[PDB]
Amino acid sequence: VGTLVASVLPATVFEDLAYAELYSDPPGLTPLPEEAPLIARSVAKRRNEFITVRHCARIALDQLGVPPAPILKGDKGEPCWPDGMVGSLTHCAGYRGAVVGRRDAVRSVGIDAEPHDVLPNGVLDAISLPAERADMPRTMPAALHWDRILFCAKEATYKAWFPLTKRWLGFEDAHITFETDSTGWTGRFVSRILIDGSTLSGPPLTTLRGRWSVERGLVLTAIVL
Numbered sequence: 001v002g003t004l005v006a007s008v009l010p011a012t013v014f015e016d017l018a019y020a021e022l023y024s025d026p027p028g029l030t031p032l033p034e035e036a037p038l039i040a041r042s043v044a045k046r047r048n049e050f051i052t053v054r055h056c057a058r059i060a061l062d063q064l065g066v067p068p069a070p071i072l073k074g075d076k077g078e079p080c081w082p083d084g085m086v087g088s089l090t091h092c093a094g095y096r097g098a099v100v101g102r103r104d105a106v107r108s109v110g111i112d113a114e115p116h117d118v119l120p121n122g123v124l125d126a127i128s129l130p131a132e133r134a135d136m137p138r139t140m141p142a143a144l145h146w147d148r149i150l151f152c153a154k155e156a157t158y159k160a161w162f163p164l165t166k167r168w169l170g171f172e173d174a175h176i177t178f179e180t181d182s183t184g185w186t187g188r189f190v191s192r193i194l195i196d197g198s199t200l201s202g203p204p205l206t207t208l209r210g211r212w213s214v215e216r217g218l219v220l221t222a223i224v225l
């Protein structure tokens with residue numbers, strides 16, 4: 001029933017792209033024959049969010065016609081999708097998200113969710129450039145926790161950047177600029193890469209366009225290339 005993530009997706013590409021979300025942990029969800037060890041000795045919170053988003057993903061992978069299968073993690077934590085597919089996962093207090101795409105229509109996917117709340121104390125100066133840390137204030141309404149939106153867009157960038165280059169991207173390795181739609185709750189962002197955009201295959205990564213949205217007290221960001 002959940003469609004919030006769609007508020008930051010390209011509708012014109014919904015043929016090859018599917019999404020599924022949940023706002024909590026439904027009882028009786030289980031891991032999978034090969035996922036159980038990845039979660040074997042983690043505390044309950046980590047357990048449930050891991051199970052729930054992987055249920056969301058398989059729903060979305062089904063809706064694209066792909067039999068269910070384990071989504072293991074690779075070194076550096078990236079989810080492992082069945083061949084031909086790509087996508088992104090996110091979880092936080094109140095939200096579980098999965099977006100999946102078919103390769104030759106979607107280069108890769110990056111999504112992130114945060115509670116639409118101020119950042120904790122020392123955090124906004126470690127993920128923001130001084131440029132961003134001064135300009136963003138002049139692009140969004142006061143009711144917007146823009147430092148949190150910035151944080152959120154940073155990680156969507158990283159999540160879409162990584163499967164393409166398998167290289168680290170720091171919070172200072174991309175500069176992001178925001179604009180807002182007339183609503184004051186949704187808008188656009190652009191991520192300029194401050195380092196070699198060399199990809200594992202194909203043209204470099206320079207600028208990532210994406211969408212953000214404040215919706216139901218969550219922050220949502222998505223990059224789909």
Ligand SMILES: [Mn+2]
Binds near residue numbers: 049090091092
């Ligand atoms: Mn999480």
Ligand SMILES: [Mn+2]
Binds near residue numbers: 112113114152155
């Ligand atoms: Mn996040």
